[model samples]
Target chain A: KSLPADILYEDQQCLVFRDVAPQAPVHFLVIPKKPIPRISQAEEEDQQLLGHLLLVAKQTAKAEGLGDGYRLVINDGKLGAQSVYHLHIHVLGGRQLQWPPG
Target chain B: APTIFSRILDKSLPADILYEDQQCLVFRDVAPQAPVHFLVIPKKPIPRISQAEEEDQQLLGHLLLVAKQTAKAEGLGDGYRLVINDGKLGAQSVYHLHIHVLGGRQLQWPPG
Candidate 1:
């Protein structure tokens, strides 16, 4: 519910915005506007919506000058480091990201 | 009843299949989070990574291998990020086991 004013992109199914707590110079989130709770809850009917979310993320990354590269993330539950219940795809770039992500 | 991915595998649903083998398949993530992003899903519906048993070791390894191959195929010269989201707290949306291959740019650590 709490998102910043920087909406990189938006459509009928999802929205893209800059992350308030960015881990990189170009960090943003692609979230489904319908509030699907989490990825585990996503069903077959959400196939297109899910696909759309990723496509938008890719498009947004290109628009954000991440053509050189970028990272897409989906934090599942607490162990996956998900703070919000709403499913979101974190697009991080503009710097090098380390491994063993937590 | 088959899962959505199963439908894709069976040709019931259409997906941009990147690669496929006896064990699993690779496809472009419709909502790609990276410059080169895709999903590697197992042929079997294992539900989640936490559910993987000893028998799944080979399959898990194969998924990683597929990620590597897919990265090369995608021409990710810089590097790539491979992620597997588990249960509810892990942020996994679909119960079907899948791994995310993200690359084509520099990434950060302690991912959120």
Candidate 2:
């Protein structure tokens, strides 16, 4: 029952890591271990598991290549930047991602 | 060809709409970054989001359930911020697929 070590993808709900402070350069972090604490405290019966965590962070960012683009953040509460209350989904891209995103 | 949100989903233009169904379309964001900004489109012109495919996965999860019920019916309550820019180095500028939906204020981070 182990899964860390910067997992790249997962199933049975959600899982996809690799952020660890890496803003871009093909970042990743599609989370959903079901501790719901953000995304407006999600609750509509979990709304299809929050769209299955953005379709597994968009097919794991096209199986890890970014397919040419990416950028799907989700920070709600505490001025929309909750450090880590559970809900996640960062998946940035390789480069050029900017615009008041901070 | 037709992208200002497909002319605000065929209404020709002019928006401020809060929410719609049969796909998606929560308006209100001519260019406001916060103070409860809005925009969670998907009237079916999947131009961005990496050109979504695979049956568009439930229309991309019904566009986040219409951005969490239009960000709690447009109150923000004290939190919000769900971006979704894609392509063009992810700085996307209205290529159809949208999702900005910023919140009331204080949304800081390396989120650009």
Candidate 3:
């Protein structure tokens, strides 16, 4: 089955997918292909790949026409409100991202 | 040009440091949003994430990697949130880019 609708971008290092539970008008999730369980667990070896993930988020954010701006978020562990075991970066935009970021 | 974080980097301020390296530093946020809250900042003078160039890729990645280290060091075993405020709409109070690490409680939604 094709999954084009959900995926916004993808490369050798990471994948950018639209958030299933969108928090804002535009919300996407950038995840690494390395399968890093949590950001807290990422090792030195995962450096370049991790960087690619953020770069992809930025790239996709631009492609999504978030000309106004966007916010990049990585939730690690329970208190961080990270639901999925696999690490993901949430890219939210299309509105004013307020302070306290809560 | 130097910001408050620069002062802390130069030891000109009373900084509550958690981690430090050649590329960046980690300090406790004076106003803690969560029980385990801190900041990971770069030594470079990139004003904001929007201002960062492709050449700064390694530095950017290092910041997130450092966020991981400091969070674990603070024993945020439960979980935490790593946020980077880009511009005004994102509520970036500080000019210099830094990763805000917050945890120790169930982080809420509408992440501002």
Q: List the DockQ of the predictions in order.
A: 0.05, 0.30, 0.71
Model 2 DockQ class: acceptable
Regions of model 3 farther than 4 Å from truth: A1-4
lDDT of each: 0.70, 0.80, 0.83
User: Which candidate should be chosen as best, given lDDT against the real structure?
Assistant: 3
lDDT of 3 at B43: 89
Displacement of residue B111 (Cα, Å) in model 3 is 1.9
lDDT tens string, model 3, B43-68? 89887777776788888889988888
The positional error of residue B3 in candidate 3, measured at the CA in angstroms, is 2.7
Candidate 1 chain A: 10-residue stretch with minimal lDDT: A74-83
- List clashing residue pairs in candidate 2: A101-B111, A101-B112, A102-B109, A102-B112
* Ranking of models by lDDT: 3, 2, 1
Residue B112 C-alpha lDDT in model 3: 73
The residue ranges of model 2 lying beyond 4 angstroms of the native Cα positions read A1-3, A7-59, A64-71, A76-81, A84-102, B1-4, B9-11, B17-37, B40-46, B52-79, B85-95, B102-112
TM-score for predicted model 3 compared with the true structure: 0.92
Which rank order by DockQ, best down to worst?
Answer: 3, 2, 1
Comparing candidate 1 with candidate 2, which one achieves the higher DockQ? 2
lDDT of 1: 0.70
iRMS of candidate 1, Å: 14.6
